[PDB]
Coordinates of C-alpha atoms and ligand atoms in Angstrom, one line a residue:
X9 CA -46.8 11.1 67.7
X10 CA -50.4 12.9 68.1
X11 CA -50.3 14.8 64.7
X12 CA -49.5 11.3 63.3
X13 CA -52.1 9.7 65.4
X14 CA -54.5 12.2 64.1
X15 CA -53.2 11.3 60.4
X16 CA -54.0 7.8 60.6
X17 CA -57.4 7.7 62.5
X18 CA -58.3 10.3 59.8
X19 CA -56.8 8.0 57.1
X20 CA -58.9 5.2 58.5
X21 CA -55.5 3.1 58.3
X22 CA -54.4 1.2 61.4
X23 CA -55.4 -2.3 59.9
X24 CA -52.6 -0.9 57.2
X25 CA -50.1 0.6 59.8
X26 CA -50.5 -2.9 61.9
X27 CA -49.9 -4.7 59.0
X28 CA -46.9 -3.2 57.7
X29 CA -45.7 -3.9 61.3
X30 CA -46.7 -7.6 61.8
X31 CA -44.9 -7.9 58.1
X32 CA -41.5 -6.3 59.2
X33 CA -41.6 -7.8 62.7
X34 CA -38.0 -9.9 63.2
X35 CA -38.1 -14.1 62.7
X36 CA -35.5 -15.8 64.4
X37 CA -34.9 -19.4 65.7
X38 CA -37.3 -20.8 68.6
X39 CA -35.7 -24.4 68.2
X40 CA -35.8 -25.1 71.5
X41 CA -39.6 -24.5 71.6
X42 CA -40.2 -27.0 69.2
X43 CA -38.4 -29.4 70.6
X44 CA -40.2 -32.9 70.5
X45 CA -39.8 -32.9 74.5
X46 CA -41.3 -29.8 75.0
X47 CA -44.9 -29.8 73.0
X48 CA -46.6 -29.5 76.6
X49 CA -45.0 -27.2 77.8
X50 CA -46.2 -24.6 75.2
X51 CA -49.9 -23.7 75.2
X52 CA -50.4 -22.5 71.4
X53 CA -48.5 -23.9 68.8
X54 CA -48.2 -20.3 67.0
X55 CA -46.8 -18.8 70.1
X56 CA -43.1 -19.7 70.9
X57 CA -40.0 -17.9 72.4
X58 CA -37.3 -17.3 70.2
X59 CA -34.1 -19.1 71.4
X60 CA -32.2 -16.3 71.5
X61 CA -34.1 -14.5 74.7
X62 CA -35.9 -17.1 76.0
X63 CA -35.7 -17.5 79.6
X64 CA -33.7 -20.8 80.7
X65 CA -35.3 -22.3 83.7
X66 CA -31.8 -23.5 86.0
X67 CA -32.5 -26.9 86.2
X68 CA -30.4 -29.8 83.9
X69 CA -33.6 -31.8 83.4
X70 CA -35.4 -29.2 80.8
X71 CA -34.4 -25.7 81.0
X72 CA -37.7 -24.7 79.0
X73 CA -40.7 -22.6 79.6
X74 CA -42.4 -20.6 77.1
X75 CA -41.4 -17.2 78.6
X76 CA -39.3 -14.0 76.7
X77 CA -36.7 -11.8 77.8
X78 CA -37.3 -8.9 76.6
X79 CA -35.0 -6.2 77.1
X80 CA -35.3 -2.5 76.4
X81 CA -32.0 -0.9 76.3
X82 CA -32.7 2.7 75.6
X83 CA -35.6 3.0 78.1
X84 CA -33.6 0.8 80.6
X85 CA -36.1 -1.7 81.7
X86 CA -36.6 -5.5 81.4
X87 CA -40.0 -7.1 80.6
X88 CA -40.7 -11.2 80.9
X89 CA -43.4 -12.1 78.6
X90 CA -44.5 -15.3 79.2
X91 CA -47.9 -17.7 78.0
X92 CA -50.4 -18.1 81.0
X93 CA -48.9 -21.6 82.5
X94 CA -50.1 -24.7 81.7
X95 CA -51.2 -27.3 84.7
X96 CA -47.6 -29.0 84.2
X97 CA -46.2 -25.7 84.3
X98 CA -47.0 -23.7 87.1
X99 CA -43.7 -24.7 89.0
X100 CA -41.8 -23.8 86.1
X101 CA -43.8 -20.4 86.5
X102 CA -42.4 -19.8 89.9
X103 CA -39.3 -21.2 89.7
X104 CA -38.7 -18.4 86.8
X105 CA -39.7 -15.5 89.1
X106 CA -37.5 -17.0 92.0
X107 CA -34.7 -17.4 89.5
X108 CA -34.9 -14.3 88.0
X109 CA -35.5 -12.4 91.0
X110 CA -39.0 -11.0 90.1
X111 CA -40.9 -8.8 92.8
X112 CA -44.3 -8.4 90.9
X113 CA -46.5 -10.4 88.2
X114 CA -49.2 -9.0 86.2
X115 CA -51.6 -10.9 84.8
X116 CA -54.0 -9.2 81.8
X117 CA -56.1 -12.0 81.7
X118 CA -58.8 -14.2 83.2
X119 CA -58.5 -18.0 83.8
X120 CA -61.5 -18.7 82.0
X121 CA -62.8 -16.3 78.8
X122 CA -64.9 -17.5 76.6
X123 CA -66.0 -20.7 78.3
X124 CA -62.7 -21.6 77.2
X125 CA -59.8 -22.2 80.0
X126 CA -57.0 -19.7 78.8
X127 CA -54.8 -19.7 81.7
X128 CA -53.9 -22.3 85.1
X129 CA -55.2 -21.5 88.2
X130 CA -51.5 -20.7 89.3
X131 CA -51.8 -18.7 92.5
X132 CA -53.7 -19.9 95.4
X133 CA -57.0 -18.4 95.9
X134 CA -57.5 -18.9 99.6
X135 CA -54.9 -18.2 102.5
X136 CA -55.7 -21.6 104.0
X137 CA -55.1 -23.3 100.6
X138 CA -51.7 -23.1 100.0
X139 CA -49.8 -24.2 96.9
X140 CA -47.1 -26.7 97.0
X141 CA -45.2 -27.4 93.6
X142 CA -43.7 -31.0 94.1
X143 CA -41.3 -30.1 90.8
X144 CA -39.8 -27.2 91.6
X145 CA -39.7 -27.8 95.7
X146 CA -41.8 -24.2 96.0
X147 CA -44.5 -23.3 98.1
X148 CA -46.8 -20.4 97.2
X149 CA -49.3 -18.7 99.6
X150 CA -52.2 -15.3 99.4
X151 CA -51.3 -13.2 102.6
X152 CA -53.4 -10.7 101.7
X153 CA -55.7 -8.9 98.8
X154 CA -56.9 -5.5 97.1
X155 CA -59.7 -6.3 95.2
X156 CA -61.0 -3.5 92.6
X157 CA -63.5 -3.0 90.8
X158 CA -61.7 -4.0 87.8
X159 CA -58.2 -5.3 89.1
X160 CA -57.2 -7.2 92.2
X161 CA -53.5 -6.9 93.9
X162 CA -52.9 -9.5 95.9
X163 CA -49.5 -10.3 98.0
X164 CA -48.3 -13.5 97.6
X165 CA -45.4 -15.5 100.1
X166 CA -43.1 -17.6 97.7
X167 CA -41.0 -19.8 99.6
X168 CA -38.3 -21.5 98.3
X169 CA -38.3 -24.4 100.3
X170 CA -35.1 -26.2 99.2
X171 CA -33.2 -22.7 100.2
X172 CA -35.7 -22.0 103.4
X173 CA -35.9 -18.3 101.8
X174 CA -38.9 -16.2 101.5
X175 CA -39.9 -13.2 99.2
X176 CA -43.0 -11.3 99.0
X177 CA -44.4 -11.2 95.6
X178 CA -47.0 -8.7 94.6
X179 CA -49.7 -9.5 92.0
X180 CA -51.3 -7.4 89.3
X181 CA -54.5 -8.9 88.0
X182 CA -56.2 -7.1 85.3
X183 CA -59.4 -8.5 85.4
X184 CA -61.6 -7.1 82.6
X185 CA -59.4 -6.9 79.8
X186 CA -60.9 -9.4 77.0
X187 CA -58.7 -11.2 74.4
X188 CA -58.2 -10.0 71.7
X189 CA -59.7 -6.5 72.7
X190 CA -58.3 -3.2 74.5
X191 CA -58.9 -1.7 77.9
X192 CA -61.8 0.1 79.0
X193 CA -60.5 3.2 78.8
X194 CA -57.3 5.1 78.7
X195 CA -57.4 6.5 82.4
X196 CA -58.3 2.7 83.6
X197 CA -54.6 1.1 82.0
X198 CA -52.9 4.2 82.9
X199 CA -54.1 4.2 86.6
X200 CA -53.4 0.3 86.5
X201 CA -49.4 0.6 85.2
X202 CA -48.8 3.4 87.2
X203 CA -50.3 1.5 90.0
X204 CA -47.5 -1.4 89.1
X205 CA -45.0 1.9 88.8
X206 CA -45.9 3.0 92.6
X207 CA -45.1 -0.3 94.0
X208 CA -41.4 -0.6 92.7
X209 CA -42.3 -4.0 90.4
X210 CA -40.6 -2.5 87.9
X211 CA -37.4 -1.0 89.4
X212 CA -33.9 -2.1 88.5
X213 CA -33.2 -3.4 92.3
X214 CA -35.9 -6.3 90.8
X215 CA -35.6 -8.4 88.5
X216 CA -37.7 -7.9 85.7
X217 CA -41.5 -8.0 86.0
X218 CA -43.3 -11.3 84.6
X219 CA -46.5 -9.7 83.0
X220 CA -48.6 -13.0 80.8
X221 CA -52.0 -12.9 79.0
X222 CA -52.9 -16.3 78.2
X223 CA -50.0 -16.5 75.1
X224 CA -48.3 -13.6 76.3
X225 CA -48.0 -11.6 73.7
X226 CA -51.5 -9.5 73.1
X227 CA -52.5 -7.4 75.7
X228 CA -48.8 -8.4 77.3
X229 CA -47.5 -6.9 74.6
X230 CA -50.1 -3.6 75.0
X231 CA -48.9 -3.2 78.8
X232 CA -45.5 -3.1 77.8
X233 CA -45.6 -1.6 74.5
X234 CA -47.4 1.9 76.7
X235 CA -44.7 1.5 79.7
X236 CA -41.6 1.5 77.4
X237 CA -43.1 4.4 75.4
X238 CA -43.7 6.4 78.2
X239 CA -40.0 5.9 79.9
X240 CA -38.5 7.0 76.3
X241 CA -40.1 10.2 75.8
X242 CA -39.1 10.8 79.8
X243 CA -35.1 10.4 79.0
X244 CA -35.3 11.4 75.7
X245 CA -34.5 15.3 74.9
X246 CA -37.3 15.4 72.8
X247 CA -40.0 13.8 73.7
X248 CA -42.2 13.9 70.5
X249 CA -39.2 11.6 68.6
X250 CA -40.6 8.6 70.5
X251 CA -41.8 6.2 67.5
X252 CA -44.3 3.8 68.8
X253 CA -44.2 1.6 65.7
X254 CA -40.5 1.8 65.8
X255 CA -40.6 0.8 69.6
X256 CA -42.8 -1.9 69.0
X257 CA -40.7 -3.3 66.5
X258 CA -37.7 -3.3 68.9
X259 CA -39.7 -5.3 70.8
X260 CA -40.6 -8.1 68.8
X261 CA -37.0 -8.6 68.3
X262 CA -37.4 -10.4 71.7
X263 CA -40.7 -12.1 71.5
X264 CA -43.2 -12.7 68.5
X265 CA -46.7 -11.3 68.0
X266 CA -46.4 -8.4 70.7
X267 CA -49.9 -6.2 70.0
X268 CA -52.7 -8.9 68.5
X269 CA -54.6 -6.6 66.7
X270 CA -54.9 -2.9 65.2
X271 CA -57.2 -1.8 67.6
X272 CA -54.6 -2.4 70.4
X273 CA -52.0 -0.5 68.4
X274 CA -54.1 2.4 68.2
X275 CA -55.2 1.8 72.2
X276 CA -51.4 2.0 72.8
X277 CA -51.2 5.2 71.1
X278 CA -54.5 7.1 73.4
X279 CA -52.7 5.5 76.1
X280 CA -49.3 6.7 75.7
X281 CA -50.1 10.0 74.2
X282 CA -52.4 10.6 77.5
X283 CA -49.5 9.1 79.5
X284 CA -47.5 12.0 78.1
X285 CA -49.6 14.6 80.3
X286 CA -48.3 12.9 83.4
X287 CA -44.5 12.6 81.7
X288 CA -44.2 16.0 80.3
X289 CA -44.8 17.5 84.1
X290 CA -48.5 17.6 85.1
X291 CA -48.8 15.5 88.6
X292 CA -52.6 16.2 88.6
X293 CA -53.6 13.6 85.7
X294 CA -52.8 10.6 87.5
X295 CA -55.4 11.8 90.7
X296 CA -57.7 12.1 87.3
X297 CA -57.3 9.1 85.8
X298 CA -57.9 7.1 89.5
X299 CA -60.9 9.2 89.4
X300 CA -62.2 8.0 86.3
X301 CA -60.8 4.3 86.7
X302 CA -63.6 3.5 89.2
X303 CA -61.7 1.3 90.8
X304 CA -64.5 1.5 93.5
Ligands
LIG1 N1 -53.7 -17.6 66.7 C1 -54.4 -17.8 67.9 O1 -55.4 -17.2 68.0 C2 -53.8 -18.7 68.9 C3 -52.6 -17.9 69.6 C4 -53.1 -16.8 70.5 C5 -53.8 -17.0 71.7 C6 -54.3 -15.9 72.5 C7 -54.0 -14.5 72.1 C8 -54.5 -13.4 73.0 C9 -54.8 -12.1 72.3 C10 -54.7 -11.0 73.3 O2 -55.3 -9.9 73.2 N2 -53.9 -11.2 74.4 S1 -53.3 -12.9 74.2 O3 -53.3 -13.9 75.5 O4 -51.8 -12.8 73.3 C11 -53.3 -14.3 70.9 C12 -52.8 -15.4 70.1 N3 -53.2 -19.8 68.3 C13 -54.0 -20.9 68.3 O5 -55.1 -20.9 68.8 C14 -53.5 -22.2 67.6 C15 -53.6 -22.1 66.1 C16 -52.7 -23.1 65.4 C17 -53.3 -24.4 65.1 C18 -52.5 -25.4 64.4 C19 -51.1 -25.1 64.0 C20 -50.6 -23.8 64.2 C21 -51.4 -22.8 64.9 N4 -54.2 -23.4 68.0 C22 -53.4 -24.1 68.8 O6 -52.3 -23.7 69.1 C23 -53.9 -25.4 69.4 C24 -53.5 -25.8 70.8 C25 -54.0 -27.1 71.3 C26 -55.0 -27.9 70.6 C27 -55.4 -27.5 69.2 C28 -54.8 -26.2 68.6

């Protein structure tokens, strides 16, 4: 994929490439979505989960929540795409991640960007301040927190309180990752997912991670467009047949608009492509890219 990245910076074509993609990307039913009942519970109108992998809250009231299953076969992993939630739908939020048995949640995103509010203030900020969700009979609350100079990890106690159980969630915010735009750097998303890697987030024990922007789709798309790629040409016998277009299609098969813009597509592609160091054998680069993360 490097001799083609080469080709196409070169060519001066990823508004072309991206395009091509965003026309072939699958269309399928989000009925549900559009629903008369459900207008609030979707934060863009543009944005919806197609009914065919949308996540079903279990309750007989309203099953709906803008979220995605998406569900990468060959690189064995599950990804929940889902829209930042809405005030009204922050127990819907959690009661997905108990549900679906979620350990970790990363968030690309900021509440407010913009001056615009992109995103509910859905985890509590303060230990003393815990959350209570009347609708979903949960209770949320911050044990503890990481904070970095550009991402935060905080653990979280989500307590079921109609089943008395407790889990430990862990939190990945990205914190300076603007809409619409691309990481920092390659070596500051790298030592970020692989930071969500080290935990176990992502392990098959888990349910599959929850990872929002503030539609879920952009930079959600980004985190899990680079993850997918990079656990593909680790299984694969030949690593350099990974095709990230081709993956990225896959993926929208699942949820619409993943990758917002061409500049992401062609972040994805540093990102993987560096990734591949790490992949192909080299334990070094990831002690590298912390180093140049800044993280402190
Ligand atoms: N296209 C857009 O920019 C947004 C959807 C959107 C929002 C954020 C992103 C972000 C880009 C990124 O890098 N990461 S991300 O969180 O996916 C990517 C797409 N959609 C809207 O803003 C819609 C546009 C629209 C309006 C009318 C009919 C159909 C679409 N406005 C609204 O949805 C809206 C909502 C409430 C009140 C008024 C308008």
């Amino acid at each position: 994929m490097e001799k083609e990245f080469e080709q196409i910076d070169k060519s001066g074509s990823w508004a072309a490439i991206y395009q091509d993609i965003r026309h072939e990307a699958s269309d399928f039913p989000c009925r549900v979505a559009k629903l008369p009942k459900n207008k609030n519970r979707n934060r863009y109108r543009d944005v919806s989960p197609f009914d065919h992998s949308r996540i079903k809250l279990h309750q007989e009231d309203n099953d709906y929540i803008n979220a995605s299953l998406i569900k990468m076969e060959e690189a064995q992993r599950s990804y929940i795409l889902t829209q930042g939630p809405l005030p009204n739908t922050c127990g819907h939020f959690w009661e997905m991640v108990w549900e679906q048995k979620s350990r970790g949640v990363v968030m690309l995103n900021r509440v407010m960007e913009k001056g615009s509010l992109k995103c509910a203030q859905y985890w509590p900020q303060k230990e003393e301040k815990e959350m209570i969700f009347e609708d979903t009979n949960l209770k949320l609350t911050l044990i503890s927190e990481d904070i970095k100079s550009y991402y935060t990890v905080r653990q979280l106690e989500l307590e079921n309180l109609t089943t008395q159980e407790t889990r430990e969630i862990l939190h990945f915010h990205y914190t300076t990752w603007p809409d619409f735009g691309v990481p920092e750097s390659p070596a500051s998303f790298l030592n970020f997912l692989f930071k969500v890697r080290e935990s176990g987030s992502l392990s098959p024990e888990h349910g599959p991670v929850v990872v929002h922007c503030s539609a879920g789709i952009g930079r959600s798309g980004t985190f899990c467009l680079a993850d997918t790629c990079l656990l593909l040409m680790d299984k694969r016998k030949d690593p350099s047949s990974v095709d990230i277009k081709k993956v990225l299609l896959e993926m929208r098969k699942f949820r619409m608009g993943l990758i917002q813009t061409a500049d992401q597509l062609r972040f994805s592609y540093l990102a993987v492509i560096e990734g591949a160091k790490f992949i192909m054998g080299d334990s070094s680069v990831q002690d590298q890219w912390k180093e140049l993360s800044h993280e402190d």
